Design a protein around this ligand. Structure first.
Ligand SMILES: Nc1ncnc2c1ncn2[C@@H]1O[C@H](COP(=O)(O)OP(=O)(O)O)[C@@H](O)[C@H]1O
Ligand SMILES: O=C(O)c1ccccc1-c1c2ccc(=O)cc-2oc2cc(O)ccc12
Lengths: 620, 38
DNA sequence: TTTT
């Protein structure tokens, strides 16, 4: 079950980085940190690590876009091993919560995205079928999922020449959440024509399994294209896995409704005892309806709130998560650990706050808190070997690593950027001329401001002057941010102005200067981490530069600038010694009418009506 | 997988030309994609 | 930006 890594070849200090990481695992180190400067080919080093050490491995990312971005990259890297994608199947999700300040109730609202649910089944099922598995996951991997042991157990195993009656197979299929559907054959479904059962495994939406009977004997098991009926391959064994990650059998369920009534009675005593009358009226009203529905249907909305009860498991119990579907001997790679670790930690506490106000006000039983992500202590318990990837490791990462593993040599020898510090007086003006110059070399600019105020003004200033610019409002969704970045790349804007440039996908090779206003102001935005990552955006260009405007040099500035300067020096040492040349890898009435024609254009692109999209483009 | 890999790749590239506003190229791809489905 |  080896990993088969598939166009590059370790360049720069990649070999050395890989060497240390692997050795580090071999030495059985629990925490290592790959201190990779931006643009150094971090995901490729990780890839090499994975191949040499040969464990199933979990890759955690802070946002879904990056996650998707790595997934793509790893499917290309290991075309022959199971790369999987474990994220939230919610395409929209407005949680249930209560606001006491206004006595109003947010109903849970949610649309499940079929493609993702499939990719999550693809993921958990893969961990049971083979060892050559990479999963790219969000913090979804610390949220809850049925017992891996109950799931591994509820697998229907078919093999040719097996004895088994067709209808018996059907029973088993229903007990694990499959749905007989003859007219609309989709994943999660099976269909029957005489001696042929066709199951559409929940983890596929393209291929299915055809089980041809003769009496009570499986004759052959085929893989077929579901739409067509075209045969892809015979199998002598097939594992069909549950079509859902949390199935309660009727027997478990009866006892649960019991336990929920007992909990409920206990809780009512305590509220009535404390004169929380309104809250008990509601707790009981709600819990009782939920219960009726569970006797009638073995289903109610918000059923997940009762999850711990459906496991028959004792209070305070750690959820089962993806972490649990892995072998004991597994590896975790934490991309952007400075952001991702905080995020992994903040999940339990953000979750428990929301539910406690719901429970205090009687919308949910206390047992509802047992439906939670993991505490970080619990996460920690699944740490066999863990590699942290960051140009700016966080405190957790530093504290637990013995020696960093640095990776600073970019593939095309692209250098860390030159930094100018200049004073706060003349700021806007000095900057203005640095932008004009840049517009003249068909190059782009990022400027970071501390505030909404300064960002807004300077943007209006730029526009007033006939410069093309966009203000990245913190309220901008990444989907939108990407339209804007692209536009910057293409030249529809020449400058971007914002507060946080460390927002996703801001790494663009056409950017030749990064201006940092109010650099000496420390805080979050001018910490060593921020400064560095911000400096980071100027290193995708053979000419990259950074101007920090500041009246003094702060501890943050010092460490930031110093590190940039050490790196650039080694990257030049190397470049020289290796003969490499740094190459770049690569008006109110009109405002409203353009916004509406851009929508109608984006719309026609999606419909693939590319001729209409172009009429609209040439309009704009 | 090999035929669908090509299709999935033509697909990506076609969304990509749309996003560059290279709609000309996007149509060309579209029309090509249609023929292979057929 | 992320989750139920
Ligand atoms: N060994 C290599 N040889 C050639 N090119 C590489 C190599 N490793 C990475 N690259 C490419 O060069 C660029 C820099 O890598 P990137 O993934 O941006 O690194 P990071 O994850 O540190 O930002 C990427 O587009 C990457 O695909
Ligand atoms: C795009 C997706 C869009 C919607 C969705 O539900 C899931 C998606 O997954 C992706 C995975 C990729 O590698 C690359 C792109 C995507």
């Amino acid at each position: 079950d080896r990993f088969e890594l598939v166009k590059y070849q370790p360049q720069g200090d990649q070999p050395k980085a890989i060497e240390k990481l692997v050795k580090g695992i071999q030495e059985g180190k629990k925490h290592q940190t790959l201190l990779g400067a931006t643009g150094t080919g971090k995901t490729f080093t990780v890839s090499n690590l994975i191949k040499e050490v040969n464990k199933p491995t979990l890759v955690i990312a802070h946002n879904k876009t990056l996650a998707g971005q790595l997934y793509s990259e790893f499917k290309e890297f290991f075309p022959n091993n199971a790369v999987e994608y474990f994220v939230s199947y919610y395409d929209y999700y407005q949680p249930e919560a209560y606001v006491p300040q206004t006595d109003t109730f947010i109903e849970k609202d949610a649309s499940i995205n079929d493609e993702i649910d499939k990719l999550r089944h693809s993921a958990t099922s893969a961990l049971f079928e083979r060892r050559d598995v990479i999963i790219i996951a969000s913090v979804s991997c610390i949220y809850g999922l049925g017992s891996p042991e109950e799931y591994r157990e509820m697998v229907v195993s078919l093999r040719t020449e097996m004895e088994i009656e067709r209808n018996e197979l059907l029973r088993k299929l229903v007990d694990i959440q499959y749905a007989r559907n003859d007219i609309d054959f989709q994943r999660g479904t099976f269909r029957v024509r005489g001696d042929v059962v066709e199951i559409f495994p929940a983890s596929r939406d393209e291929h299915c399994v055809r089980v041809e009977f003769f009496g009570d004997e499986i004759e052959r098991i085929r893989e077929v294209d579901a739409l067509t009926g075209e045969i892809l391959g015979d199998r002598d064994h097939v594992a069909i896995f549950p079509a859902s990650h949390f199935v309660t059998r009727a027997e478990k369920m009866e006892k649960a409704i019991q336990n929920i009534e007992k909990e409920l009675e206990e809780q009512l005593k305590v509220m009535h005892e404390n004169g929380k009358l309104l809250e008990a009226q509601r707790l009981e009203q709600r819990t009782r309806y939920d219960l009726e529905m569970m006797r009638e249907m073995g289903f109610c909305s918000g059923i997940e709130n009762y999850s711990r009860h459906l496991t028959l498991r004792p209070p305070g119990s750690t959820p089962y998560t993806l972490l649990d579907y892995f072998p004991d001997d597994f590896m975790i790679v934490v991309d952007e650990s400075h952001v991702t670790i905080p995020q992994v930690r903040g999940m339990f506490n953000g979750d428990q706050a929301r539910k406690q106000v719901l429970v205090d006000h009687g919308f949910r039983l206390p047992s509802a808190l047992d439906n939670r992500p993991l505490r970080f202590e619990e996460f920690e318990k699944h740490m066999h070997n863990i590699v942290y990837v960051s140009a700016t490791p966080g405190p957790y990462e530093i504290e637990h690593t013995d020696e960093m593993v640095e990776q600073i040599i970019r593939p095309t020898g692209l250098l860390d950027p030159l930094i100018d510090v200049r004073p706060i007086e003349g700021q806007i003006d000095d900057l203005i001329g640095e932008i004009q110059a840049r517009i003249e070399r068909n190059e782009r600019v990022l400027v970071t401001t501390l505030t909404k105020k300064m960002s807004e003004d300077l943007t209006d200033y730029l526009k007033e002057i006939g410069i093309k610019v966009n203000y990245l409002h913190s309220e901008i969704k990444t989907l939108e941010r990407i339209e804007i970045i692209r536009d910057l790349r293409l030249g529809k804007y020449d400058v971007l102005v914002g507060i946080n440039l460390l927002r996703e996908g801001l790494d663009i090779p056409e950017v030749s200067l990064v201006a940092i206003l109010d650099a000496d102001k420390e805080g979050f935005l001018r910490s060593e981490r921020s400064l560095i990552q911000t400096i980071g955006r100027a290193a995708r260009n053979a000419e990259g530069r950074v101007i920090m405007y500041a009246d003094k040099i702060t501890k943050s500035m010092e460490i930031a600038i110093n590190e940039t300067k050490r790196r650039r020096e080694q990257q030049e040492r190397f470049n020289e010694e290796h003969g490499i040349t740094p190459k770049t890898i690569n008006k109110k009435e009109r405002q409203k009418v353009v916004e509406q024609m851009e929508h109608e254009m984006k719309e026609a692109a999606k419909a693939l009506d590319f001729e209409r999209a172009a009429e609209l483009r040439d309009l704009l | 997988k090999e035929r669908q890999k090509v299709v999935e790749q033509m697909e990506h590239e076609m969304k990509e030309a749309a996003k560059a506003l290279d709609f000309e190229r996007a149509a060309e791809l579209r029309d090509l994609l249609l023929e292979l489905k057929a």
